[model samples]
Target: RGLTIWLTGLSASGKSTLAVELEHQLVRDRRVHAYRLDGDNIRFGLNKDLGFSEADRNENIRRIAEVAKLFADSNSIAITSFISPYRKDRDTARQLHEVETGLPFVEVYVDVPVEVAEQRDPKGLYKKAREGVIKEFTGISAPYEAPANPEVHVKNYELPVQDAVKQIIDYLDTKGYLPAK
Candidate 1:
């Protein structure tokens, strides 16, 4: 199985941005099959009917986690981005990789403030959430529990995208996911 790197944070916290760069980096290596999954893309289909209720949320994560496990078993690097507000759900995903696929799971927390995310609302979710158009929107109308033992935390919201990508790759290298140069 390949590595499962789950990127978790509030909306507009740069999960997809980082995942894109990471996928590009892995693709350049020509040794990894990289798959990037975002909640919006998955929810549009697989989780379209799911809601913000606690039970539904758990089921949402569970379904995604299983899919991630399958990706890891294929030895393809799977990077998933989701708000994933519940610690139990996130941990369950991690444990699934550890126990089922025997692959290392790294939790990367974008760690950006809700205010910062709102300011950078690329999708305008924050605004809709505030207007009550969306129910259970994380970091606005809903709750998000940050990863307590995240493998790495990107604390500098203003850091350049290149810098953030470098830091994340460096952390993975240190963790033995990448061979040292």
Candidate 2:
């Protein structure tokens, strides 16, 4: 099985952007098949009817993790970008993928401050959430339990996107998940 890299971070933290560039690097290397699963797109499709409640969020990650495992079983690198607020849910997803497929789960924490994310407001989620237009949002309006000990922590505030992608790729390489050149 290939790598199943889970990128966890708050909205507007540049997780998706990093994932896109990382895919390009993987492709250039002529190595594994890297596929990215973005949160909003998944929510708009398979998880369409799901609300922003904690229960729905839990189920959302659960379903995505199962799908990721299937991709990993095919020896494809599956990368997921989501604001998985609850550590327990992330842990559960990790366990599910590991026990079911024997594939390792690498959790990458995209740590961006609430202030920075709010300033970026790429999706205007923070604005709506603060205005009470949205409910059960992570961070500002709700709760986001940061990963206590992630396999890789992308300090978005201090690191460049290139550096972050390199760090993640390096981690995968060290683990022998990446095809050595």
Candidate 3:
């Protein structure tokens, strides 16, 4: 069965990193197939025109969710990484998968503190946002609503990347999202 693993967190919270690792393991070890829709990579193409405003963010997530549904419908796992900073927007995506498509929608909260994310600013985004250069930056200028009851809560800051990936894969296995090894 196909499913959507929605990874939401602050910037530099290790969402993309974990997604990449998960996809790698899915293909190599588990023999399961998965695709990753990362935030920065999407912005370069599909969402190139979208800005970081509230409306743009909402539209960004909506569009990604729709595409993920398409992938899920075809029996392929879709791993999405985004700083989806709002609860309502994320909920809408969940409903689209669980209610409309009847596919599993696993929300993975890549939990990390703002302070830790700032320190690990791999893209230097936090520094720019703190310098008043970038506006509407989640966890800096804008708000990020932590998922209240996500299917998987990955404390990425405290765990190794491999461990985080293992946790997610375990969840998928438990939920019957993965095929027999």
Candidate 4:
């Protein structure tokens, strides 16, 4: 439990769902210690003062990186789910862990088209963005920079949930993150 896996994707692209499932499978099946730094939960408390502005977005990811680093220091996998739409911010996260802190940081791109996300809009956020009700919405009014080289690039919207979970868990196992059975 010394790594941070950041799940980045567009709205309704299954990031939160994947992160939750990953943590549950890790703990219940693999018996590994795991926790998820949920996006909305973070904003509800730690990032409550932040907004959708570009600078706030940067700070949001920045704080998340630092927090994940702490979790890694305590020897527990820290999974974060968020839009994290900027390449620069994500790079900073990786740099913080792999360089300064010397901990492993995995970038998980929950790949899906905006059209697909829009259709899977459980929160009705895409519709709100379409109606100009939500301003600066990622993949709508704002930009979402897809990761060029993610540690695990998952088509979360297309694959079965278990398959996606298995794919990530396999990667973690192969990378020596998971304890030997």
TM-score of each: 0.89, 0.91, 0.93, 0.94
| Best candidate according to TM-score | 4
lDDT of 1 at 173: 76
Q: Which model is ahead, 3 or 4, in terms of TM-score? A: 4
Model 2 agreement with the true structure over 26-131: per-residue lDDT tens digits:
8778566889887565878888878767688788888889888888888888889888878998998899876743898999999899889999997789999998
Against the true structure, what is every candidate's RMSD?
Answer: 2.1, 1.8, 1.6, 1.5
TM value for model 2: 0.91
Candidate 3 lDDT trough over 10 residues, lowest sum: 95-104
lDDT of 4 by residue, 20-134 (tens): 8999898888787888897666888999999877788799989999999899889888999988889999998999897643899989999998899999899899999989999
Where model 3 places Cα greater than 4 Å from the true spot, the runs are none
Give the winner by lDDT: 1 or 2.
Answer: 2
lDDT of 1 by residue, 45-145 (tens): 99999987878889899888888878877888888988788899998888877882288888988889889989999888899999999887888777889
**lDDT, each prediction:** 0.83, 0.85, 0.89, 0.88
Error of 3 at 87 (Å): 1.0
- In model 3, what is the error at residue 162, expressed in angstroms? 0.4
Tell me the lDDT of candidate 2: 0.85
Q: List the residue pairs that clash in candidate 4.
A: 1-75, 1-76
